């Protein structure tokens, strides 16, 4: 049965019936607004043999009203669709308990090759061309902040200003902010894929302040990849 | 007749003068670099973070 | 001794490679090859004679 | 006869005697087996007996 | 699995295969009728014969082989021979008219009309196969079918099987002994196929085999029977690592990596030791070091080439029997330390070693003396361009007057083909010597 | 003409007279009826013509 | 605290089989899986390496790897091969051909999914996994490529777990493969990035041990695997048994790794003596400390006397006096400060395990982070440069799609490691 | 229309065991 | 509290026969209909699937359907054929001819009247039934056509009661016909709004279950059907046996259907152990849950990596504690929460039954509603578009009174279902 007839025959109150009906219609409206795969149609310039037939097939031939009913029901369906139910809930937390993202994480991305790879390819170009190549001064906010932090740390450790060769290190480090708010680096970065923190208790991690990149699910090959047997 | 094949699919042997790039050793002071690495490294704790309360 | 009960693989003081029958195995190999080579030189003589 | 966790090694050390290597083969078999078993005593309560 | 498909082309390839299969039947216990003893429990059953023989419902162990000859003589005599019920009635293809030592006739006119079902039989063998390690081709580029038809089969196999490994054992014309007079033409014309559609090529000229047989094997009348027996021994030694157990098991694609440094560089030398008779078998000491030294003796190869006239690139040693790693390492060390043998500067190690627990077998009335330990050599070295130099000099003498070219022209081959093959072989020898050139 | 009958005795076959055999890696399960024991018996990893 | 082991390749699998034989002998477990131990110390911490089944069978915490199924079959045929779980045998149809590209990108990748499934399930079976162990050969293709691909995806899932790698680096005069320098160079940087501690093995010094220390007339690979199994079992003696001064893999790592890239250890064992010289040898702490520091006793082909000891560790096993086990370390430091690094005072850590291997009154395993590893890495670097200069065997590796740039990456990383060790060797106070 | 494949007719008198 | 079952098509009839064999074995009913069980728990709720006759014989509540009488003869001549009521064998003279149109409009209609007569008689004969079960294959003619017609008529007649159908969706790699796209689409667009809940079956997954979990030699259709039978028994066990945490079909429907159109479930079983590795693994709640959530353990061939669990349900049978059967669900919900959705928290339903299947001390049946189940629908839709774009094999369906509009509507509904599954496949946090 159709849903309308089903609730007409059921034993709900009128308000409950219209409530269930509205729930179904709003679900179907959301489904309509959702993206699909196009309903494929027969090709143009199709072979004639696909259409024209033989007397045997016309012997085994066993509808207009049925098609008209189909079209009328469809037409009223898109009329109703043409004529928000689902809402999001606030996940925000009060002041003093909020979580903040990492600007270094926002700057870093999978598509862009990392700083270590950047320095490696610069060294590769240097060796291949046989000439010293000048590393361009980076204009990114994360890059300049990391360079300033490296220079400050180098000054604090060794009482002299570092050379350009020594500042070439700032490129090959991943940087992040700590709780105190000062720029630092991660010695043992964690994978973007969900991982495990084994303290005295073993705990899941989706996103921790210890990862180079933003959390992403790992791509895994399908289990039913080959034929089951040899 | 069987078609003549004059193809040269297998690559030509590299010349002895032709060579790749070798070396590429990082010409930087490793002990100082590691010390600066330690100095600017941030602490990391696998301990579960302080999750906020449901009333927060 | 060579039949110590307490020197297993974990103690590592009784190895599998000392090969105490090394001389006996050499002697057996040598006698086997003498039999083979005498037979085959007889076969070669038979081939020439035939 | 599994050896207990709190096996007193001092008792075995008192039992062992110098110049007590048997000549006969099965006697050596058993003596060396006992020597192997002797090594499973714990140091934390090595001489502890509770007396 | 771990099975390779053997293909035999030409009187020479067919006789090579006959010797190889009469060796393999004794190696795995299959009787000439095609039956071997079998177990009752299904759990315990060896499949060391899987590499060469495929089981049948009637208990037969059919070899994974094809024989192909335009002349029906050899294949018909095999059909009338001892192994008639061993070899499949199919996969034993027979022609009606031979190539007559003509590469053009064996590649364009007569080879074309039989290669068509040759691929049918090869692909049937591959379909029966499940773990193909590679194709295992034996022929002689001296004649017509071995060179022209074998070539044609090689490029069809390459085009319909992609990058499947191919091991081609070719009986090159010897420096000074050869059956035919158009044999240099056939060899030079086949060089293209052996270069482009052969992943590893092994040289098996009869000159070195005859000299080795007379010197060490000590036979007055060496024959094709003896030389094919030696070829069977070397083939069995090469394949024994995947056939049976061993400390260091090596597969076809496994040692291809260590043997072939460059795709154009794959024509390799071969040698076997101890290839001795019963006379010296119980008078000279056959240790691992001694057999390795005999292998690396430049008079012991199945190919008459002088390694001192070049420099080694990669040596693959198949040790079998009494061999132990602690002795093969010492043999490698002494080979390295003796300076009569040199390697290219860019290959410091230069050695691949595969140890197998199966001592080599013999045959009834075997010219080889049974030994408990042996070792085979597959060596890629720059001196192999020297036999190419010999054959192209023969080709140049033949082609200066454009003699014996009318047969090839009339069998549908352009004259420029001789030129093309000439600069191809010249490029090959140049590539060899440039590989051997110091940096 | 007992060549193919008897088998060469190696480090790996053991000594038939003495009965002591080297226990090495790389040995497949043995069927004592084939041409030779050193035969790639691959039943465990390759359950042949099944599955 | 559990450690799960994975053995990859022909070398790695046979080493792991011998190691599991050693551990089963330690814990009194016969090949059928039952427990016939003579003491309850073998049963208290049997869960470290073995998982009990419904019937009481103790299945080793082992995962087996290869591309050639013959290694799996031989391991199963081994005397203790019936111990391992049948589904833990993961194998392919075609071997790696000593090709790191096939072992790491094409054949290994298409096979490593089930390997990770088995490793994940067995890791979660543990109550609190102490660490992962790997045994492989850098010279080989499936041992190096697949093992590195293992540790790469195990480090990401378990960042804090101890990666306990045993890599068998090939030796020049012991070599039996020509692409060994390529595989070793491509695997060294992966080991650097994804191993808490990599403890190298070399067949050169293994044969040196067998021929001079043990005076074996014909040592096969079994003796070498036994020598490796010695240290593989001795590094976890404090894990499996009590002691006066306990330790674990993480304590060893923190005491032996001064900087993250310096985690390559050269090892040794004691006591080890020949059959004829064993009745003349009086076992003592002094003899153990004499043999543990001997250059000939080292199973690495890198001379200890050339470099300087960053850190050293003495995993002593057995009932011994603590002030002398500490004194044999302080005395050797005092009289051989030239063999140790000045700016690291007290270079030697000592730990005591209550239970020695049965039949031994006491034994010891030495773990050394000597600065002489750069020499055995530089030898491989020289071989790699020689082969790579003339494009030798690059077509085999580039067939799978791996890159000349990645070859250069591996070379640069290995040179960086070598120069790291050299700079920390010649750095002064 | 190509000639018949794997045909045993028309091969008589020619050096072919099968025809195309 | 009872379920009356129907088998449609050859596949459905064979699966139902195996299921009835399993149920009779569990309840101690031999083929002649008597009872030889050794427990009162087998008789206390034997009325769920069996009706007692005058002589005490327990006739199964089963209705058999196929246009081909050959399978009717086969099932009645089988070992448990005498169990079924003779009048419930409902069959035609001419087969459905692998035609959804023939089985749904021309030949199915002329027999569906008597089919509904039999089902109505059984439903009113028994007291107060939980619902209807059906078993069929969507790639067939009468299993899909007559099965969907039966589902539609039963929704017309008894909407009060639950509806559960086991549909064997074909796979291209198992495809033994050519009209899988047409039949599967014409059946699924019916089951979307007709069947109350429809869990999926794929022979592709059934084959490699017999390999990655069973490693058996000769897998046949009868071998495959036992998996479906065991999962059915685990699904409906709690209605027949007591448990600490009880459940029934309506409870599963409520806990696994968040939206009415999302009722297609992915299903699995555990334990699945091989004969060789039977004693090696130690079965426990951890292993059961790991096998439940293992991708290769599913008996439907859609990859769960590419989707996220809308809901999950674990139906445990046997003797186990409650905190470690809930703690392992918590464990997975934490370890691999990427399988799960955040807007529906705590996605796992759990039930405990005290009676395990024969031969198990612990067992469990897993039913998951995942966003990955649309993979089979996408592949079948791609095949459908390929076939329908060129009007291939459409004359057979159009000559049986069906029009192109039915196929168009089926494609539209399939696309809508795929899209509404793909809504939540994104791994949002
Ligand atoms: N090693 C070895 N060489 C052979 C053998 N038989 C022939 N040869 C050599 O290999 C060359 C091949 O020539 P053929 O024997 O005529 O082979 P073919 O060209 O295929 O035969 P045709 O097509 O009739 O010309 C000959 O010139 C011989 O010198 C053999 O049995 N063993
Ligand atoms: N110590 C030891 N070394 C071995 C063993 N097996 C092989 N090797 C070494 O490993 C190297 C070759 O490794 P390979 O077998 O190719 O590794 P795989 O490709 O991963 O299986 C050789 O140089 C041997 O010295 C063994 O059982 N023990
Ligand atoms: N699991 C299982 N699948 C089956 C069985 N019989 C047939 N099938 C599958 O069902 C498909 C054919 O369906 P079919 O029996 O013709 O459906 P019907 O026409 O309605 O009876 C095939 O692709 C088979 O894979 C069986 O006994 N068990
Ligand atoms: Mg001829």
From TrEMBL, chain D:
**Region span, Disordered:** 1-23
- Polar residues bias locations: 4-18
This protein's superkingdom?
A: Eukaryota
| Name recorded for this polypeptide | Uncharacterized protein
UniProtKB/TrEMBL annotation, chain F:
- Protein origin, superkingdom: Eukaryota
Q: What is this protein called?
A: Uncharacterized protein
The organism of origin for this protein: Leishmania tarentolae (Sauroleishmania tarentolae)
Included range, full protein: 256 to 306 of 306
From TrEMBL, chains G, I:
Give the UniProt keywords, A-Z.
Coiled coil, Cytoplasm, Cytoskeleton, GTP-binding, Magnesium, Metal-binding, Microtubule, Nucleotide-binding
Residue spans making up a coiled coil are 407-429
GO cellular component terms, semicolon-separated:
microtubule
Gene Ontology terms, MF aspect:
GTP binding; GTPase activity; metal ion binding; structural constituent of cytoskeleton
Q: Where in the cell is it found?
A: Cytoplasm, Cytoskeleton
Q: Which cofactor does it need?
A: Mg(2+)
Stretches assigned to the Tubulin/FtsZ GTPase domain? 46-243
Q: Name one GO biological process term.
A: microtubule-based process
User: What region holds the Tubulin/FtsZ 2-layer sandwich domain?
Assistant: 245-382
The record's subunit annotation is: Dimer of alpha and beta chains. A typical microtubule is a hollow water-filled tube with an outer diameter of 25 nm and an inner diameter of 15 nM. Alpha-beta heterodimers associate head-to-tail to form protofilaments running lengthwise along the microtubule wall with the beta-tubulin subunit facing the microtubule plus end conferring a structural polarity. Microtubules usually have 13 protofilaments but different protofilament numbers can be found in some organisms and specialized cells.
Quote the function comment for this protein. Tubulin is the major constituent of microtubules, a cylinder consisting of laterally associated linear protofilaments composed of alpha- and beta-tubulin heterodimers. Microtubules grow by the addition of GTP-tubulin dimers to the microtubule end, where a stabilizing cap forms. Below the cap, tubulin dimers are in GDP-bound state, owing to GTPase activity of alpha-tubulin.
Family in the record: Belongs to the tubulin family.
UniProt-recorded name of the protein = Tubulin beta chain
Source organism of the structure? Leishmania tarentolae (Sauroleishmania tarentolae)
Automatic annotation (TrEMBL), chain H:
Tell me which positions the record assigns to the signal sequence: none
Q: What top-level branch of life does the organism fall under?
A: Eukaryota
The cellular location(s) given in this protein's UniProt record come to: Cell projection, Cilium; Cytoplasm, Cytoskeleton
Protein name according to UniProt: Enkurin domain-containing protein
What organism does the UniProt record list as the source? Answer: Leishmania tarentolae
Parent-record interval covered: 37 to 56 of 279
């Amino acid at each position: 049965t159709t849903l309308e007839k089903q609730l007409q025959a059921s034993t709900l109150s009128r308000q409950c019936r219209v409530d269930l009906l509205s729930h179904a219609q709003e679900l179907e409206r959301s489904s309509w607004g959702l993206s699909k795969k196009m309903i494929t149609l027969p090709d143009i310039k199709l072979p004639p043999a696909t259409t024209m037939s033989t007397d045997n097939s016309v012997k085994r031939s066993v509808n207009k009203e049925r098609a008209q009913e189909y079209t009328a029901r469809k037409q009223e369906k898109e009329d109703m669709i043409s004529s928000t139910y689902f809402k999001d809930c606030s996940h925000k937390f009060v002041k003093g308990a909020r979580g903040f993202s990492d600007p270094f994480r926002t700057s870093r991305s999978r598509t862009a090759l990392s700083g270590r790879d950047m320095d490696f390819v610069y060294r590769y170009a240097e060796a291949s061309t046989g000439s010293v190549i000048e590393r361009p001064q980076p204009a990114d906010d994360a890059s300049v902040a990391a360079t300033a932090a490296y220079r400050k740390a180098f000054q604090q450790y060794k009482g002299r200003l570092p050379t350009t060769e020594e500042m070439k290190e700032a490129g090959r480090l991943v940087y992040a902010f700590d709780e105190n708010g000062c720029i630092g680096v991660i010695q043992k970065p964690h994978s973007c894929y969900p991982h495990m923190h084994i303290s005295a208790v073993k705990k899941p991690i989706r996103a921790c302040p210890y990862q180079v990149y933003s959390p992403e699910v790992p791509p895994v090959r399908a289990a039913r990849s080959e034929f089951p047997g040899p | 007749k069987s078609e003549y094949h004059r193809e040269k699919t297998k690559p030509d042997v590299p010349l002895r003068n032709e060579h790749p790039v070798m070396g590429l050793r990082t010409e930087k002071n490793f002990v100082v670099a590691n010390a600066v690495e330690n100095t600017m490294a941030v602490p990391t704790k696998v301990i579960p973070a302080a999750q906020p309360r449901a009333t927060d | 001794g060579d039949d110590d009960p307490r020197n297993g693989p974990s103690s590592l003081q009784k190895f599998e490679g000392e090969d105490l029958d090394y001389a006996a195995r050499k002697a057996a190999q040598q006698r086997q090859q003498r039999q083979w080579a005498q037979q085959q030189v007889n076969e070669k003589l038979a081939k020439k004679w035939m | 006869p599994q050896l207990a966790r709190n096996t007193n090694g001092a008792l075995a050390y008192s039992q062992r005697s110098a110049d007590s290597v048997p000549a006969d083969e099965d006697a050596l078999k058993e003596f060396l087996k006992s020597r192997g078993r002797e090594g499973f005593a714990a140091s934390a309560y090595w001489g502890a007996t509770g007396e | 699995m771990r099975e390779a498909i053997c293909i035999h082309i030409g009187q020479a390839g067919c006789q090579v295969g006959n010797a190889c299969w009469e060796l393999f039947c004794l190696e795995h216990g299959i009787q000439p009728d095609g039956s071997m003893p079998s177990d009752k429990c299904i759990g315990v059953e060896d499949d060391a014969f899987n590499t060469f023989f495929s089981e049948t419902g009637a208990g037969k162990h059919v070899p994974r082989c094809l024989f192909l000859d335009l002349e029906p003589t050899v294949v018909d005599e095999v059909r009338t021979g001892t192994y008639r019920q061993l070899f499949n009635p199919e996969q034993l293809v027979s022609g009606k008219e031979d190539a007559a030592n003509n590469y053009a006739r064996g590649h364009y006119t007569i080879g074309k009309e039989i290669v068509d079902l040759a691929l049918d039989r090869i692909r049937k063998l591959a379909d029966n196969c499940t773990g193909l390690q590679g194709f295992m081709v034996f022929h002689a580029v001296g004649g017509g079918t071995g060179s022209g038809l074998g070539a044609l089969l090689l490029e069809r196999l390459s085009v319909d099987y992609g990058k499947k490994s191919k091991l081609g054992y070719t009986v090159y014309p010897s420096p000074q002994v050869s059956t035919a007079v158009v044999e240099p033409y056939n060899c030079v014309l086949s060089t293209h196929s052996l270069l482009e559609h052969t992943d590893v090529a092994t040289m098996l000229d009869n000159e070195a085999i005859y000299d080795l047989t007379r010197r060490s094997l000590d036979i007055e009348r060496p024959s094709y029977t003896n030389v094919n027996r030696l070829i069977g021994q070397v083939v069995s030694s090469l394949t024994a690592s995947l056939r049976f157990d061993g400390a260091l098991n090596v597969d076809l694609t496994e040692f291809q990596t260590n043997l072939v440094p460059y795709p154009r560089i794959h024509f390799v030398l071969t040698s076997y030791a101890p290839v001795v008779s019963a006379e010296k078998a119980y008078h000279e000491q056959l240790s691992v070091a001694d057999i390795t030294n005999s292998v690396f003796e430049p008079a012991g190869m199945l190919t008459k080439c002088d390694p001192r006239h070049g420099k080694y690139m990669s040596c693959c040693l198949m040790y079998r029997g009494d061999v132990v790693p602690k002795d093969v390492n010492a043999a490698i060390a002494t080979i390295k330390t003796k300076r009569t043998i040199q390697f290219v500067d860019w290959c410091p190690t230069g050695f691949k070693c595969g140890i197998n627990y199966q001592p080599p077998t013999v045959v009834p009335g075997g010219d080889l003396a049974k030994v408990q330990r042996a070792v085979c050599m597959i060596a890629n070295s720059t001196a192999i361009a020297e036999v190419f130099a010999r054959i192209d000099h023969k080709f140049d003498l033949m082609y200066s007057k454009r003699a014996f070219v009318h047969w090839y022209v009339g069998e549908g081959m352009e004259e420029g083909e001789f030129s093309e093959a000439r600069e191809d072989l010249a490029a090959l020898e140049k590539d060899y010597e440039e590989v051997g050139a110091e940096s | 003409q007992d060549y193919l009958s008897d088998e060469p005795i190696t480090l790996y076959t053991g000594n038939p007279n003495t009965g002591k055999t080297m226990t090495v890696h790389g040995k497949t399960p043995v069927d004592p009826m084939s041409s030779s024991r050193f035969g790639k018996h691959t039943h465990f990893s390759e359950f042949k013509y099944a599955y | 605290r559990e450690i799960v082991s994975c053995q990859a390749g022909q070398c790695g699998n046979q080493i792991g089989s011998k190691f599991w034989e050693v551990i089963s002998d330690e814990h009194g477990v016969d090949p059928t899986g039952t427990y016939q131990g003579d003491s309850d110390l073998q049963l208290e911490r049997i869960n470290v390496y073995f998982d009990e089944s419904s019937g009481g069978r103790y299945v080793p915490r082992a995962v087996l790897m290869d591309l050639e199924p013959g290694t799996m079959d031989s391991v199963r045929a081994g005397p203790y091969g019936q111990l391992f779980r049948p589904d833990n045998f993961i194998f392919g149809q075609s071997g790696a051909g000593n090709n790191w590209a096939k072992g790491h990108y094409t054949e290994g990748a298409e096979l490593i999914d089930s390997v990770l499934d088995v490793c994940r399930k067995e890791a979660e079976s543990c109550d609190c996994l102490q660490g992962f162990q790997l045994s492989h050969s850098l010279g080989g293709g499936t041992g190096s490529g697949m093992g590195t691909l293992l540790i790469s995806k195990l480090r990401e899932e378990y960042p804090d777990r101890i990666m306990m790698t045993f890599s068998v680096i090939p030796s020049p005069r012991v070599s039996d493969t020509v692409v060994e320098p390529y595989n070793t160079t491509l695997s060294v940087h992966q080991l650097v990035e994804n191993s808490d501690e990599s403890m190298c093995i070399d067949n050169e010094a293994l044969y040196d041990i067998c021929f001079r220390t043990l005076k074996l007339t014909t040592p096969t690979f079994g003796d070498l695997n036994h020598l490796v199994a010695a240290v593989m079992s001795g590094v976890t003696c404090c894990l499996r048994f009590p002691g006066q001064l306990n330790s674990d893999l993480r304590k060893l790592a923190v005491n032996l790794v001064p900087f993250p890239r310096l985690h390559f250890f050269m090892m040794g064992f004691a006591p080890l003596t020949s059959r004829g010289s064993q009745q003349y040898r009086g076992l003592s702490v002094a003899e153990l400390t004499q043999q543990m520091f001997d250059a000939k006793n080292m199973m690495q082909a890198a001379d200890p006397r050339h470099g300087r000891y960053l850190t050293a560790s003495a995993l002593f096993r057995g009932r011994m006096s603590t002030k002398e086990v500490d004194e044999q370390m302080l005395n050797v430091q005092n009289k051989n400060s030239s063999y140790f690094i000045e700016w690291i005072p007290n270079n030697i850590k000592s730990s005591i395990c209550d239970i020695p291997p049965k039949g031994l009154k006491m034994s010891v395993t030495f773990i050394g982070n000597n600065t002489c590893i750069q020499e055995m890495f530089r030898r491989v670097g020289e071989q790699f440069t020689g082969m790579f200069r003339r494009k030798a065997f690059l077509h085999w590796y580039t067939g799978e799609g791996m890159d000349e740039m990645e070859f250069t990456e591996a070379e640069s990383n290995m040179n960086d490691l070598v120069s790291e060790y050299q700079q920390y060797q010649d750095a002064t106070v | 229309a190509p000639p018949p494949t794997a045909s045993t007719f028309g091969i008589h008198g020619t050096s072919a065991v099968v025809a195309n």
